Design an enzyme around this catalytic site. Structure first.
Site, mmCIF file in Angstrom:
data_model
loop_
_atom_site.group_PDB
_atom_site.id
_atom_site.type_symbol
_atom_site.label_atom_id
_atom_site.label_comp_id
_atom_site.label_asym_id
_atom_site.label_seq_id
_atom_site.Cartn_x
_atom_site.Cartn_y
_atom_site.Cartn_z
ATOM 1 N N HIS A 1 0.848 -1.217 0.000
ATOM 2 C CA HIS A 1 0.000 0.000 0.000
ATOM 3 C C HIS A 1 0.878 1.259 0.000
ATOM 4 C CE1 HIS A 1 -2.825 -3.289 0.887
ATOM 5 N NE2 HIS A 1 -3.563 -2.571 0.030
ATOM 6 N N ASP B 1 3.622 6.002 -5.522
ATOM 7 C CA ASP B 1 3.643 6.140 -6.998
ATOM 8 C C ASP B 1 2.735 7.315 -7.384
ATOM 9 O OD1 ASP B 1 3.542 5.833 -9.746
ATOM 10 O OD2 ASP B 1 3.319 3.634 -9.664
ATOM 11 N N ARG C 1 0.858 6.840 -10.795
ATOM 12 C CA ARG C 1 -0.345 5.988 -10.601
ATOM 13 C C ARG C 1 -1.411 6.799 -9.852
ATOM 14 N NH1 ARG C 1 -2.403 4.823 -5.464
ATOM 15 N NH2 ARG C 1 -3.802 3.026 -5.554
ATOM 16 N N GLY D 1 -11.864 -3.618 -4.749
ATOM 17 C CA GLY D 1 -10.552 -3.751 -4.103
ATOM 18 C C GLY D 1 -10.044 -2.407 -3.637
ATOM 19 N N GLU E 1 -13.404 -4.549 -0.169
ATOM 20 C CA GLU E 1 -12.014 -5.013 0.014
ATOM 21 C C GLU E 1 -12.053 -6.366 0.715
ATOM 22 O OE1 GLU E 1 -8.893 -4.104 -0.917
ATOM 23 O OE2 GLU E 1 -8.320 -5.964 0.144
ATOM 24 N N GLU F 1 -17.496 -10.780 -5.510
ATOM 25 C CA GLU F 1 -18.345 -11.841 -6.097
ATOM 26 C C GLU F 1 -19.539 -12.160 -5.185
ATOM 27 O OE1 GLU F 1 -14.945 -11.975 -6.262
ATOM 28 O OE2 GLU F 1 -14.438 -12.408 -8.346
ATOM 29 N N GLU G 1 -8.214 -0.694 -9.494
ATOM 30 C CA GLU G 1 -6.794 -0.832 -9.836
ATOM 31 C C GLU G 1 -6.506 -2.322 -9.725
ATOM 32 O OE1 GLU G 1 -3.815 1.395 -7.554
ATOM 33 O OE2 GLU G 1 -2.520 -0.254 -8.343
ATOM 34 N N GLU H 1 -4.677 -11.387 -13.079
ATOM 35 C CA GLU H 1 -5.574 -11.975 -14.111
ATOM 36 C C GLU H 1 -6.976 -12.139 -13.523
ATOM 37 N N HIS I 1 5.543 1.851 -10.006
ATOM 38 C CA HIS I 1 5.882 0.635 -9.228
ATOM 39 C C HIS I 1 5.691 -0.632 -10.086
ATOM 40 C CE1 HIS I 1 1.536 0.604 -8.840
ATOM 41 N NE2 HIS I 1 1.641 -0.687 -8.476
HETATM 42 N N1 SAH Z 1 -12.535 -10.224 -5.459
HETATM 43 C C1 SAH Z 1 -12.115 -9.231 -4.680
HETATM 44 N N2 SAH Z 1 -13.020 -8.508 -3.976
HETATM 45 C C2 SAH Z 1 -12.582 -7.511 -3.191
HETATM 46 N N3 SAH Z 1 -11.333 -7.093 -2.981
HETATM 47 C C3 SAH Z 1 -10.459 -7.809 -3.710
HETATM 48 C C4 SAH Z 1 -10.762 -8.861 -4.560
HETATM 49 N N4 SAH Z 1 -9.608 -9.364 -5.145
HETATM 50 C C5 SAH Z 1 -8.648 -8.610 -4.662
HETATM 51 N N5 SAH Z 1 -9.089 -7.657 -3.774
HETATM 52 C C6 SAH Z 1 -8.292 -6.634 -3.102
HETATM 53 O O1 SAH Z 1 -7.974 -5.650 -4.057
HETATM 54 C C7 SAH Z 1 -6.784 -4.938 -3.643
HETATM 55 C C8 SAH Z 1 -5.853 -4.740 -4.838
HETATM 56 S S1 SAH Z 1 -4.657 -3.380 -4.614
HETATM 57 C C9 SAH Z 1 -5.885 -2.111 -4.225
HETATM 58 C C10 SAH Z 1 -5.496 -0.708 -4.583
HETATM 59 C C11 SAH Z 1 -6.449 0.321 -3.970
HETATM 60 N N6 SAH Z 1 -7.389 0.840 -5.000
HETATM 61 C C12 SAH Z 1 -5.647 1.477 -3.352
HETATM 62 O O2 SAH Z 1 -5.870 2.604 -3.804
HETATM 63 O O3 SAH Z 1 -4.842 1.209 -2.422
HETATM 64 C C13 SAH Z 1 -6.192 -5.730 -2.466
HETATM 65 O O4 SAH Z 1 -6.365 -4.926 -1.298
HETATM 66 C C14 SAH Z 1 -6.943 -7.076 -2.537
HETATM 67 O O5 SAH Z 1 -7.098 -7.704 -1.283
HETATM 68 C C1 TQ7 Z 2 -2.769 -9.939 -15.561
HETATM 69 N N1 TQ7 Z 2 -1.930 -9.934 -16.747
HETATM 70 C C2 TQ7 Z 2 -0.675 -10.334 -16.603
HETATM 71 O O1 TQ7 Z 2 -0.316 -10.934 -15.589
HETATM 72 C C3 TQ7 Z 2 0.328 -10.008 -17.647
HETATM 73 C C4 TQ7 Z 2 0.477 -8.900 -18.490
HETATM 74 C C5 TQ7 Z 2 1.617 -8.959 -19.291
HETATM 75 C C6 TQ7 Z 2 2.335 -10.085 -19.061
HETATM 76 BR BR1 TQ7 Z 2 3.993 -10.549 -19.836
HETATM 77 S S1 TQ7 Z 2 1.635 -11.124 -17.881
HETATM 78 C C7 TQ7 Z 2 -2.499 -9.497 -18.036
HETATM 79 C C8 TQ7 Z 2 -3.662 -10.394 -18.438
HETATM 80 C C9 TQ7 Z 2 -4.975 -10.080 -18.114
HETATM 81 C C10 TQ7 Z 2 -6.003 -10.973 -18.381
HETATM 82 C C11 TQ7 Z 2 -5.733 -12.189 -18.976
HETATM 83 C C12 TQ7 Z 2 -4.432 -12.509 -19.314
HETATM 84 C C13 TQ7 Z 2 -3.404 -11.616 -19.050
HETATM 85 C C14 TQ7 Z 2 -2.719 -7.989 -18.069
HETATM 86 C C15 TQ7 Z 2 -3.557 -7.397 -19.007
HETATM 87 C C16 TQ7 Z 2 -3.650 -6.021 -19.102
HETATM 88 C C17 TQ7 Z 2 -2.905 -5.217 -18.270
HETATM 89 C C18 TQ7 Z 2 -2.072 -5.788 -17.340
HETATM 90 C C19 TQ7 Z 2 -1.985 -7.164 -17.230
#
Ligand code: SAH
Ligand code: TQ7
Ligand code: SAH
Ligand code: TQ7
Lengths: 321, 321
Positions: free
Chosen positions: A9, A15, A18, A42, A64, A93, A107, A116, A267
């Protein structure tokens, strides 16, 4: 046992690129957000949720899953915003919202499986909770690839030659070993490059419009495509760098947050794909190939088939676990 | 899968302070080593073994348990020294030497269990293979402790107050959380300090003479002792730093390799013991206590009982796994 929690965090808020891009991306949509409702997927420490309130949202749901929600709860209460921003612990979900929302902010971007399936959670919440033609922040993402020569790697590969000049023992015979160890693995190395590391014009190989239904189904197959470029000058090419940008819609023209080595550092740095050894390129050397990102032990595979100059097509597949 | 192998050996050879101290420590004993035989315990890439040949040893046994011995074999052959330096793979506890040796060289020092039992291997090989009144390089080690104020930690603890000035949201309420997470754990943090971080005169709390029999038995109980010092000026004290020095006997006067924050920086840095929160000290504030290092899940425990000023005695125990 939460010193990892803090480092992550801290790194994100520190950053400026960002944090400002989200701030401004969010503020520039004040007209669509004022008096409207938002879902922050999140929320982390809650700062994106509070930018949404700054931009004038009447109600923001900050969801979160992880321990950091307590801290999000504390930060919102302390900023006197608990009547406008409701921190809900647990996965998005299964969260119960009273109403469908006008906007979603997240984010989710990064490199590896965590990211992913953070995007899958954002698509799930679009489908379930966002109104027909609702606002997504960011709204799209693009992926770029380019051949690179990595100075930090060049320095590490030549270090064993420097030993004689310094301690009067010759270890130059370990160049072969350092190469196998530093380039011969099948891992994505996350490292920050500069513009000077870049050997051709970056090529976009994929675009994701988050608004599109069947994006979820389309990500089954895995995102990627073909690329072709021409090198600028003589260099030892070490492999490829991959990075993303995302787009916030404008009032104005759209705002772009880029993780390119040409843009200021984030970052996220860039994701590096090393060949098994260096290959010398020259001005106008053609570099083409095909890159696929797709999930699989649960692992994100990167499939690369590529061609440098008059050399034969090669395959190198990578993973992140 | 040897990119970890490379990072470690690179970091050691790149440490000029470490590499020169061994070089010179070894060379300055040319009179005792010329025409004599040497055992290098954990030869790594073999550079200590080859310093021993430079210093004039007739025969050096370079024993290396791990994969890096191949590379040690390659470096010795390539320097045309295979007739004087014999790389033997495997643990030193079971290597078969033809003769008892005149000297042992080892780089066993560091923080954690790997290093506690690397020293046990050096004592085992003293006992088994070194001649009555034989040469040990280094011959001794001393441990130091001092109260510290850590600027890098001060900066991290105040970061949450800076957010308002930059992104117009107040997160100063997370100072408490950052403190618990960054100081409230029970881990040794390995970090490099500067002289300005140091709040009193360092105190030596233990000396190990490697020549002594029953050192092995004495390490059962665990090394440590009492300390007392007086702070220099007003500061937020974050905890204690611990570091070592080792001594190579001279021709001359002895050579000392120090990992002190007052001396030039080494890959060893210093070992940091954070209190659970900062305590403000002033000029002449008494800081006393007792520190014990001993092994135990297999873990190296650091037991600290300490007193700052008119505050009550406290216990904080640490571990490395
Ligand atoms: N399915 C889900 N539902 C809710 N929170 C989730 C999630 N999957 C991941 N997260 C949470 O999403 C975050 C990603 S980083 C979060 C960045 C935040 N917007 C900021 O400004 O600090 C983590 O804290 C992680 O625990
Ligand atoms: C989560 N992703 C990654 O870990 C990677 C991106 C680059 C490398 Br080399 S691996 C991807 C991504 C998202 C969904 C499905 C498959 C890949 C991503 C997409 C857009 C933007 C950021 C990430
Ligand atoms: N009991 C044992 N016998 C032999 N080698 C050992 C050992 N315990 C640890 N080692 C090896 O000792 C090394 C410690 S680091 C070695 C530094 C080396 N002198 C150099 O100049 O690079 C490692 O390579 C480790 O595998
Ligand atoms: C291996 N040791 C450590 O991991 C630590 C040292 C400082 C901290 Br705090 S932990 C110690 C050590 C060696 C033998 C027995 C017990 C401890 C050491 C001694 C001299 C020199 C260096 C290290």
């Amino acid at each position: 046992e939460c010193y990892s929690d803090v480092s992550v965090h801290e790194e994100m808020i520190a950053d400026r690129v960002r944090t400002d891009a989200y701030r401004l991306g969010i503020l520039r949509n004040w007209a669509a957000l004022r008096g409207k409702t938002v879902l922050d997927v999140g929320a982390g420490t809650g700062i994106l949720s509070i930018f949404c309130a700054q931009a004038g949202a009447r109600r923001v749901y900050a969801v979160e899953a992880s321990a950091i929600w307590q801290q999000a709860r504390e930060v919102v209460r302390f900023n006197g915003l608990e009547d406008r921003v409701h921190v809900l612990p647990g996965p998005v979900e299964t969260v119960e919202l009273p109403e469908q929302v006008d906007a979603i902010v997240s984010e989710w971007m990064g490199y590896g499986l965590l990211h992913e399936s953070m995007l899958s959670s954002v698509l799930h919440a679009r489908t379930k909770w966002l109104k027909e033609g609702g606002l997504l922040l960011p709204a799209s993402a693009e992926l770029f690839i380019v051949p690179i020569s990595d100075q930090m790697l060049e320095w590490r590969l030549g270090f064993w030659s420097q030993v004689k000049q310094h301690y009067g023992v010759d270890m130059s015979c370990l160049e072969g070993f350092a190469t196998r160890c530093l380039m011969g693995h099948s891992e994505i190395v996350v490292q920050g490059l500069s513009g000077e590391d870049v050997l051709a014009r970056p090529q976009r190989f994929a675009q994701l419009e988050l608004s599109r239904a069947g994006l979820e189904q389309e990500l089954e197959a895995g995102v990627g495509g073909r690329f072709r470029c021409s090198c600028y000058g003589s260099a030892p090419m070490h492999g490829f760098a991959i990075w993303f940008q995302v787009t916030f819609p404008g009032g104005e023209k759209p705002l772009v947050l880029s993780t390119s080595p040409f843009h200021p550092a984030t970052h996220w740095k860039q994701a590096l794909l090393y060949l098994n050894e260096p290959v010398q390129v020259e001005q106008d050397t053609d570099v083409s190939g095909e890159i696929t990102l797709l999930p699989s032990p649960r692992r994100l595979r990167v499939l690369l088939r590529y061609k440098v100059g008059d050399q034969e097509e090669k395959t190198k597949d990578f993973a992140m676990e």
